[PDB]
Structures are given as structure tokens and as C-alpha cells.
Amino acid sequence: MKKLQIAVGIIRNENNEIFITRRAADAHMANKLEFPGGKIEMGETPEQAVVRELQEEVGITPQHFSLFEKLEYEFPDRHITLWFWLVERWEGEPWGKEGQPGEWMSLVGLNADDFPPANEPVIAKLKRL
């Protein structure tokens, strides 16, 4: 069968709000309010897959780790796996290569609408809260 993995993480900061890449003052799309963790799949392990993206989507040296939640669902042969890593802190500024630089925003009320629907499955459950 065919499978496809994805890993994502909310970058926590001092303020306790997590820097989510969104808008970025006139960018490609305002619906890109997502976080690092794109291309972890490739051919690594559930852990060693994101570990490589973690630095690729942050670049800096942040106290980032742990898994807040992961969405596991398998479609007609083509299965999908989304692993969310609960980040705690980040030194300097996050760069890596996730997307359009975002601002430190409170995760207490993340918006699945303003963010890519590709990750809505997991965020939906919480966002709906």
C-alpha cells in the first residue's frame, strides 16, 4: 500500500504564545497560518523524519520537542500520518525554511481557517474547542 507522513510543530516562546507563520505583511497567501514540519516523511523514521525538518524549518537552536498530538488516518490504500510536536522555546529568531515569518501569537485560540486546510484534520479537533 501507499503511505504519506507529515510532522508539524507549534513554536513556543517566552510570552507563552507560539510564533506561527501567517500572512507576513502581504505574502503568497493569508491562509498559510501554519507551523514548521513539511517534508519530514521522505524516508526517515517517525522521529528522525521531523528531526531533520525541525532544524530545516527553524534553523536556529530552540528548546523544541515533544509531541502534542498526531493525526493517524488511512484512506483507500493511501494513508496519511500527521505528527504534531509540542515546542517549548526558541533562541533568537526562527528561520529554518518553513515559510513566511510569523509573529508570536497565543496558541490558546489557533485558527484552522486562517491556516492551511491540509492540516485542518488535527487542528479541527482542538480548534473546534
- Which of the ranges 16-24, 36-44, 46-54, 60-68 carries the binding residues for ligand 8OG, by CB under 6 A? 36-44
Q: Report the Cα–Cα distance between both ends of the chain, in Å, rounded.
A: 34
Distance CA 71, CA 74 (A): 10
Residue type, 88: E
DSSP at 12: B
Q: Which residues bind Mg ion (CB under 5 A)?
A: 38-39, 53, 56
- Which of the ranges 9-17, 24-32, 38-46, 64-72 carries the binding residues for ligand 8OG, by CB under 6 A? 38-46
- Which of the ranges 13-21, 37-45, 83-91, 96-104 carries the binding residues for ligand 8OG, by CB under 6 A? 37-45
Distance CA 10, CA 94 (A): 11
39 interacts with ligand 8OG by CB under 6 A: yes
38 interacts with ligand 8OG by CB under 6 A: yes
Nearer to ligand 8OG, 56 or 88 (CB): 56
Candidates 95, 103, 84, 91; CA nearest to 21 is: 103
Distance CA 85, CA 21 (A): 16
| Smallest separation (angstroms) from ligand 8OG to the CB of 45 | 15
Residues that bind ligand 8OG (CB under 6 A): 4, 6, 38-39, 41, 118
